[PDB]
Design a protein around this motif. Structure first.
Motif, PDB file in Angstrom:
ATOM      1  N   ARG B 117       0.788  -1.317  -0.188  1.00  0.00           N
ATOM      2  CA  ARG B 117      -0.077  -0.003   0.021  1.00  0.00           C
ATOM      3  C   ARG B 117       0.937   1.078  -0.108  1.00  0.00           C
ATOM      4  NH1 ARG B 117      -0.730   1.709   5.596  1.00  0.00           N
ATOM      5  NH2 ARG B 117      -3.285   2.372   5.409  1.00  0.00           N
ATOM      6  N   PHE B 118       2.027   1.085   0.207  1.00  0.00           N
ATOM      7  CA  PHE B 118       3.290   2.313   0.294  1.00  0.00           C
ATOM      8  C   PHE B 118       3.617   2.416  -1.209  1.00  0.00           C
ATOM      9  CE2 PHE B 118       3.292   0.403   4.356  1.00  0.00           C
ATOM     10  CZ  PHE B 118       2.674   1.314   5.193  1.00  0.00           C
ATOM     11  N   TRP B 124      12.270   8.773   5.817  1.00  0.00           N
ATOM     12  CA  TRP B 124      13.270   7.691   6.478  1.00  0.00           C
ATOM     13  C   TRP B 124      13.665   6.281   5.929  1.00  0.00           C
ATOM     14  CZ3 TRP B 124      13.405   5.350  11.992  1.00  0.00           C
ATOM     15  CH2 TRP B 124      12.159   4.930  12.445  1.00  0.00           C
ATOM     16  N   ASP B 125      12.478   5.855   5.361  1.00  0.00           N
ATOM     17  CA  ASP B 125      12.673   4.563   4.809  1.00  0.00           C
ATOM     18  C   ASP B 125      13.957   4.499   3.764  1.00  0.00           C
ATOM     19  OD1 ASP B 125       9.590   2.729   5.023  1.00  0.00           O
ATOM     20  OD2 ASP B 125       9.851   4.866   5.705  1.00  0.00           O
ATOM     21  N   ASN B 161       6.880  13.917   4.485  1.00  0.00           N
ATOM     22  CA  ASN B 161       6.785  12.371   4.971  1.00  0.00           C
ATOM     23  C   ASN B 161       6.928  11.434   3.721  1.00  0.00           C
ATOM     24  OD1 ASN B 161       5.737   9.733   6.070  1.00  0.00           O
ATOM     25  ND2 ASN B 161       4.453  10.784   7.615  1.00  0.00           N
ATOM     26  N   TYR B 167       0.865  14.346   2.842  1.00  0.00           N
ATOM     27  CA  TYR B 167       2.100  14.371   3.756  1.00  0.00           C
ATOM     28  C   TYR B 167       2.876  15.689   3.708  1.00  0.00           C
ATOM     29  CZ  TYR B 167       1.941   9.050   3.720  1.00  0.00           C
ATOM     30  OH  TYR B 167       1.536   7.892   4.138  1.00  0.00           O
ATOM     31  N   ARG B 170       4.112  17.821   7.239  1.00  0.00           N
ATOM     32  CA  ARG B 170       5.013  17.053   7.975  1.00  0.00           C
ATOM     33  C   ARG B 170       6.373  16.550   7.352  1.00  0.00           C
ATOM     34  NH1 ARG B 170       0.483  13.636   8.555  1.00  0.00           N
ATOM     35  NH2 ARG B 170       0.710  11.481   7.732  1.00  0.00           N
ATOM     36  N   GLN B 172       9.768  13.870   8.244  1.00  0.00           N
ATOM     37  CA  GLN B 172       9.868  12.631   8.923  1.00  0.00           C
ATOM     38  C   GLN B 172      11.268  12.541   9.584  1.00  0.00           C
ATOM     39  OE1 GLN B 172       7.864   8.191   7.865  1.00  0.00           O
ATOM     40  NE2 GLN B 172       9.378   8.744   6.376  1.00  0.00           N
ATOM     41  N   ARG B 242      -5.982  12.644   9.947  1.00  0.00           N
ATOM     42  CA  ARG B 242      -5.223  12.127   8.657  1.00  0.00           C
ATOM     43  C   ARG B 242      -5.931  11.608   7.594  1.00  0.00           C
ATOM     44  NH1 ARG B 242      -1.355   7.979  10.938  1.00  0.00           N
ATOM     45  NH2 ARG B 242      -3.168   7.572  11.915  1.00  0.00           N
ATOM     46  N   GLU B 244      -5.229   9.604   5.103  1.00  0.00           N
ATOM     47  CA  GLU B 244      -4.932   8.201   4.822  1.00  0.00           C
ATOM     48  C   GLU B 244      -5.488   7.410   6.148  1.00  0.00           C
ATOM     49  OE1 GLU B 244      -3.109  10.620   5.687  1.00  0.00           O
ATOM     50  OE2 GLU B 244      -1.528   9.957   7.004  1.00  0.00           O
ATOM     51  N   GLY B 275       7.823   8.650  12.807  1.00  0.00           N
ATOM     52  CA  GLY B 275       7.922   7.422  12.145  1.00  0.00           C
ATOM     53  C   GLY B 275       7.431   6.345  12.956  1.00  0.00           C
ATOM     54  N   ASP B 277       4.426   5.704  14.574  1.00  0.00           N
ATOM     55  CA  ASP B 277       3.042   5.826  14.659  1.00  0.00           C
ATOM     56  C   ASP B 277       2.571   4.398  14.747  1.00  0.00           C
ATOM     57  OD1 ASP B 277       4.085   6.029  11.799  1.00  0.00           O
ATOM     58  OD2 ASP B 277       2.001   5.664  11.366  1.00  0.00           O
ATOM     59  N   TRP B 412       5.157   0.084  17.059  1.00  0.00           N
ATOM     60  CA  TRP B 412       6.285   0.522  17.297  1.00  0.00           C
ATOM     61  C   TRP B 412       6.462   0.343  18.868  1.00  0.00           C
ATOM     62  CZ3 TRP B 412      10.518   1.856  14.108  1.00  0.00           C
ATOM     63  CH2 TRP B 412      10.081   2.041  12.922  1.00  0.00           C
ATOM     64  N   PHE B 475      10.545  -5.471   1.025  1.00  0.00           N
ATOM     65  CA  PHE B 475      10.111  -4.133   1.712  1.00  0.00           C
ATOM     66  C   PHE B 475      11.183  -3.401   1.863  1.00  0.00           C
ATOM     67  CE2 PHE B 475       8.472  -1.260   4.568  1.00  0.00           C
ATOM     68  CZ  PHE B 475       7.098  -1.077   4.328  1.00  0.00           C
TER      69      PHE B 475
HETATM   70  O1  LIG Z   1       4.325   2.041  11.502  1.00  0.00           O
HETATM   71  C1  LIG Z   1       3.440   2.438  10.513  1.00  0.00           C
HETATM   72  C2  LIG Z   1       4.261   3.651   9.703  1.00  0.00           C
HETATM   73  C3  LIG Z   1       5.740   3.298   9.015  1.00  0.00           C
HETATM   74  C4  LIG Z   1       6.600   4.203   9.126  1.00  0.00           C
HETATM   75  O2  LIG Z   1       7.627   4.221  10.160  1.00  0.00           O
HETATM   76  C5  LIG Z   1       7.300   3.963   7.874  1.00  0.00           C
HETATM   77  O3  LIG Z   1       7.825   5.444   7.427  1.00  0.00           O
HETATM   78  C6  LIG Z   1       5.945   3.656   6.848  1.00  0.00           C
HETATM   79  C7  LIG Z   1       6.468   2.961   5.500  1.00  0.00           C
HETATM   80  O4  LIG Z   1       7.141   1.852   5.571  1.00  0.00           O
HETATM   81  N1  LIG Z   1       5.481   3.092   7.914  1.00  0.00           N
HETATM   82  C8  LIG Z   1       3.867   2.594   7.394  1.00  0.00           C
HETATM   83  C9  LIG Z   1       3.539   3.590   8.723  1.00  0.00           C
HETATM   84  O5  LIG Z   1       3.634   5.132   8.134  1.00  0.00           O
HETATM   85  C10 LIG Z   1       2.768   5.739   6.836  1.00  0.00           C
HETATM   86  O6  LIG Z   1       1.372   5.021   7.056  1.00  0.00           O
HETATM   87  C11 LIG Z   1       0.736   5.844   7.648  1.00  0.00           C
HETATM   88  C12 LIG Z   1      -0.791   5.223   7.584  1.00  0.00           C
HETATM   89  O7  LIG Z   1      -1.000   3.973   7.617  1.00  0.00           O
HETATM   90  C13 LIG Z   1       0.679   7.498   7.474  1.00  0.00           C
HETATM   91  O8  LIG Z   1       0.072   8.115   8.572  1.00  0.00           O
HETATM   92  C14 LIG Z   1       2.112   7.743   7.891  1.00  0.00           C
HETATM   93  O9  LIG Z   1       2.481   9.086   7.849  1.00  0.00           O
HETATM   94  C15 LIG Z   1       3.128   7.212   6.763  1.00  0.00           C
HETATM   95  O10 LIG Z   1       4.424   7.386   7.350  1.00  0.00           O
END
Ligand SMILES: OC[C@H]1[C@@H]2[C@@H](O)[C@H](O)[C@@H](CO)N2C[C@@H]1O[C@H]1O[C@H](CO)[C@@H](O)[C@H](O)[C@H]1O
Ligand SMILES: OC[C@H]1[C@@H]2[C@@H](O)[C@H](O)[C@@H](CO)N2C[C@@H]1O[C@H]1O[C@H](CO)[C@@H](O)[C@H](O)[C@H]1O
Lengths: 503, 503
Positions: B117-118, B124-125, B161, B167, B170, B172, B242, B244, B275, B277, B412, B475
């Motif tokens: 879905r990304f 940061w990824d 982000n 995004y 903000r 990251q 948000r 999303e 990061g 969340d 996290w 990933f």
């Molecule tokens: O833990 C879920 C976070 C984690 C982030 O640390 C990574 O940068 C990213 C992609 O690998 N990831 C998925 C998710 O963050 C993203 O998705 C959420 C919604 O599901 C967004 O709100 C967030 O801004 C986005 O970074």
């Protein structure tokens, strides 16, 4: 490459701060309107490098890296009316494409600006300006301006305070639906149909977030009271100093260490959004600007304007042949009107007023905003009568309608009279047959305008009503309102071109 | 006229966005946030309002018509390493052009996305992903990606982000400076010289407002403690749900009627900016996400990255021949290191930790963030040795480094192991000679990764370390870190393509 407009403090980083604090220019708005000669990011880098080298000169650096903002002679013996009618071209700008990085935002059609340091279109000023354009037969220019606002709704999501990057974070007292009705006077229902979606999109901007908002809470430009009453407030999405008033805003916040600066910046910006920057109306201490709390105050003018928007949205829906939709907007407007009568009327004092979200009470102070419920036909006849009395007693002065009766030292307060409020009061009172007070405001203010015209040969942004940045000349809304009142005070069949000295 | 970047979908579409998300027409809230409007949202909203006012309106059919939803066989027998190396083109996008109202933002160069879905670049990824790209010789892609991020700093003022309209408010965890240094490993000083101005501009974004901030106050991403110490925090400029994660965020705020929803939204968004969340790290009550208070917590990971940014800025200044500027940056970095050792070290417990602006105290909880000061070489040696002990006793698990020791149910937190934290921990420990602990983390995490690969032939976003939206596959960062770890754990002359079964 799509542009994401960024205000000058963000574009330039601390260079902006530095140039403003150094006061290289006597008006803070001057550098806000400078056009960078190259990518601001590269200017910033060059600046850090040059500060760390030998004999650096900030004024010289600015001169080579930016372009800065750049005298009307009328033929002799013009009346007040001729003078105004001849100024339109002088106040008209055509800026269809702007340099990259310019704070001035492009607009597809010509537009009238207020005058002086105001070298961009202003949202609420325009309505009053357009009334004068319409009055003198300049309907192309009126249609140009309605198109420009519709385009900004389409491009930005709302109409910004004016067409500058540093105005995008806010709007202003919403007159767009009223401008569409004005255009409809000339084009008929066609105007309503042409702009229905843009009017709806504006309304959505004002109401954004409403549907998830819990009772007793606020978000952005919406409030929902404990009983579920929905009203609007003025709000700016940013919480930093205004680029165009950078050093002033910083001084204001610094002078009050009892509140986080960000909160004060947000309230200052939101008062700019209200058009009343600044006024005792917003302040806990009427003599200290730094006590203002605009975002915790539900304004009665704004909400009258929102009722008017909802009523026009109903009329445009109907003209589009959407009857069920028109009924939805009427229902919305009916609720707004109940909200105004319950929460924006002070029954102890007998006049309309703002609602206080901290104390959960109607506020006490009477200001010229109290006439807006009349202007939009939301008010009860009995309350309109009481407003005529309140107006005669507290606000009417020899030179026109006083903004408030508080001499705070701020612009939106005694003894200042502002054209838009003269006209709103006049029209409001006439709506309810209070001709005498209406006519008194009109004659008093016109007399004040004519006096300054005779002595100085100009019109200015505001007038001292106690007799009949520096003071700016032109001046968009003064000119428009003067034309409307001129026509009002002399018979239709024998119009005057100057205010008659004897009534 | 140059096209403007679109507002986020909630702002763009008005209440239609809210309606579609609340209806849960799609099982992922992110799906409709990534919907491409087929025409102008202004006209879609008006059509929506009109059609709602008729019999048999169907929401899903309306969405199907007005929006377009977003849109691999490897050779048989691949090892883990070969699988990763073959996947780079699969995860690579080229989107130099997007439709005017797409939430997807254009980028000028190809870029690797995480997977699933990304479907966009992540701040940061990308660093950990680019480490993998660099390791497998794909320096063109590394350069593409650095160029992209420099471009975003140029057009937006910061790195968002990810490249989505929702995004932009903000950033990251800031790794751009480290990406530039990565590219410098291949290019030499040319990379630092080329990207110095963009690194400086990112720095100005993090420190924006610092010049006028009083001690004891905060604003945007900057905090100034009472003794004048300067640190950063995570911050989002918006205070709404948000797009999303629309329904989730609304439900979260609704379940705590003790705080304004806007504060909770701002704290949710700010955690997304971190990061992490979400995590017990930010929460007063670990079973109530609605008690999180991200913006009142000074993160030790962010401030380590800020130190490293300052160190890199000095190094880039020196490479560009501005020695005095370089010394200025060294001084800022020195001040930052003092801040970290003072306010982000918990001496009672013997580990690095976040600082709490509400209680004015270093927090007690140990998380993997605490390895960051070792990673960026900010930590005193004696504190680094303490961190190795803390890591062994509390965080190290059979399947890798635990994110925290709290099993909250959030991502996290225990028992989740995330690749970026594995690598940050491994390198930081190695920076201080703590080879045994660093190798344990690598062997344990790699073994976890290998077993999922053996069983399912994929790599995924995170791993349960207790043993060796739905879970996403790809990933990016897991692939990047796995390559670096595989090189680490085997002899240079006996490279491994799969993790050996016996260490
Ligand atoms: O833990 C879920 C976070 C984690 C982030 O640390 C990574 O940068 C990213 C992609 O690998 N990831 C998925 C998710 O963050 C993203 O998705 C959420 C919604 O599901 C967004 O709100 C967030 O801004 C986005 O970074
Ligand atoms: O009180 C001065 C206000 C007054 C507004 O009510 C009008 O819309 C505008 C132009 O006639 N006007 C000047 C001033 O507002 C403008 O200028 C200030 C800076 O001096 C801006 O901060 C403000 O947003 C803008 O409307």
């Amino acid at each position: 490459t799509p542009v994401t407009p960024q205000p000058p403090d963000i574009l330039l980083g601390p260079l902006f701060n530095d140039v403003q604090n150094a006061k290289l220019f006597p008006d803070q708005k001057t550098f806000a309107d400078a056009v960078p000669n190259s990518d601001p990011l590269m200017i910033l880098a060059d600046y850090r490098m040059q500060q760390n080298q030998s004999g650096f000169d900030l004024r010289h650096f600015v001169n080579v890296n930016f372009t800065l903002p750049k005298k009307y002679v009328p033929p002799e013996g013009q009346s007040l009316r001729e003078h105004i009618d001849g100024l339109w071209p002088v106040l008209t700008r055509s800026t269809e494409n702007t340099e990259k990085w310019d704070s001035l935002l492009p607009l597809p059609e010509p537009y009238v600006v207020p005058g002086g340091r105001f070298r961009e279109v202003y949202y609420w000023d325009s309505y009053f300006t357009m009334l004068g354009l319409a009055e003198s037969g300049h309907w192309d220019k009126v249609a140009d301006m309605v198109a420009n606002f519709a385009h900004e709704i389409d491009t930005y999501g709302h109409i910004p305070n004016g067409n500058r990057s540093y105005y995008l974070s806010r709007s202003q007292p919403p007159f767009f639906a009223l401008m569409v009705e004005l255009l409809a006077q000339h084009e008929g229902d066609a105007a309503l149909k042409q702009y229905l979606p843009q009017m709806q999109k504006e309304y959505a901007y004002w109401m954004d977030g409403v549907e998830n908002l819990q009772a007793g809470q606020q978000e952005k430009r919406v409030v929902k009271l404990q009983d579920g009453t929905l009203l609007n407030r003025y709000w700016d999405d940013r919480d930093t100093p205004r680029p165009e008033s950078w050093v002033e805003d910083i001084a204001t916040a610094k002078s009050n260490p009892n509140r986080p600066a960000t909160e004060i910046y947000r309230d200052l910006r939101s008062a700019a959004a209200s058009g009343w920057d600044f006024s005792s109306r917003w302040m806990d201490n009427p003599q200290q600007l730094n006590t203002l709390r605009t975002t915790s105050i539900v304004p009665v003018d704004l909400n009258s304007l929102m009722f008017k928007m909802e009523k026009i949205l109903a009329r445009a829906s109907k003209a589009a042949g959407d009857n069920a939709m028109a009924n939805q907007y009427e229902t919305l407007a009916n609720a707004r009107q109940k909200g105004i009568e319950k929460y924006l009327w002070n029954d102890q004092q007998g006049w309309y007023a703002d609602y206080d979200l901290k104390s959960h009470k109607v506020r006490n102070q009477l200001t010229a905003a109290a006439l807006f419920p009349l202007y939009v036909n939301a008010a009860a006849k009995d309350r309109a009568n009481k407003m005529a009395t309140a107006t005669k007693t507290h606000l009417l002065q020899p030179g026109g309608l006083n903004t408030t009766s508080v001499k705070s030292g701020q612009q939106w307060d005694a003894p200042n009279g502002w054209a838009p409020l003269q006209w709103v009061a006049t029209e409001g009172l006439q709506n309810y047959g209070q001709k005498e007070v209406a006519m008194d405001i009109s004659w008093h203010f016109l007399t004040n305008v004519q006096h300054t015209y005779d002595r100085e040969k100009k019109l200015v942004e505001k007038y001292d009503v106690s007799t009949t940045y520096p003071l700016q000349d032109g001046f968009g809304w003064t000119n428009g309102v003067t034309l409307k009142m001129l026509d009002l005070i002399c018979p239709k069949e024998q119009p005057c071109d100057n205010v008659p000295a004897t009534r």
